[PDB]
């Protein structure tokens, strides 16, 4: 078992589940036997640290479309770029 690192998109792997995302300080309350957390669409949302009884939110590390704004080429070759739904940092 390696160390656990937070707030970066990582390849996490707990007892039997793999995934990719951001592990953050949860605040949900697991039942003292509960390990995982599923979302409304049966998708993982939190985990229990198998070496420390604390709970971690999981978030999909950011993705989005990349759109290229442009006046017609025969007007210019200059383009702007929109990264949808991402924060101007992750880019």
């Amino acid at each position: 078992s390696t160390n656990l690192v937070k707030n970066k998109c990582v390849n996490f792997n707990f007892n039997g589940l793999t995934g990719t995302g951001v592990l953050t300080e949860s605040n949900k309350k697991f039942l003292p036997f509960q390990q995982f957390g599923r979302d409304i669409a049966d998708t993982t949302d939190a985990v229990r640290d198998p070496q420390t009884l604390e709970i971690l939110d999981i978030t999909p590390c950011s993705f989005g479309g990349v759109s290229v704004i442009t006046p017609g080429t025969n007007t210019s070759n200059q383009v702007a770029v929109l990264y949808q739904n991402v924060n101007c940092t992750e880019v």
Partner: peptide, 27 residues
């Protein structure tokens, strides 16, 4: 060793979890 023995069948249930994660009702 007054006890009860009921049997389990393969049924479908609909379970209601409240905010804290507890099954507070079922159908």
């Amino acid at each position: 060793l007054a006890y009860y023995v009921g049997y389990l069948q393969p049924r479908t249930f609909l379970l209601k979890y409240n905010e804290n994660g507890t099954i507070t009702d079922a159908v």
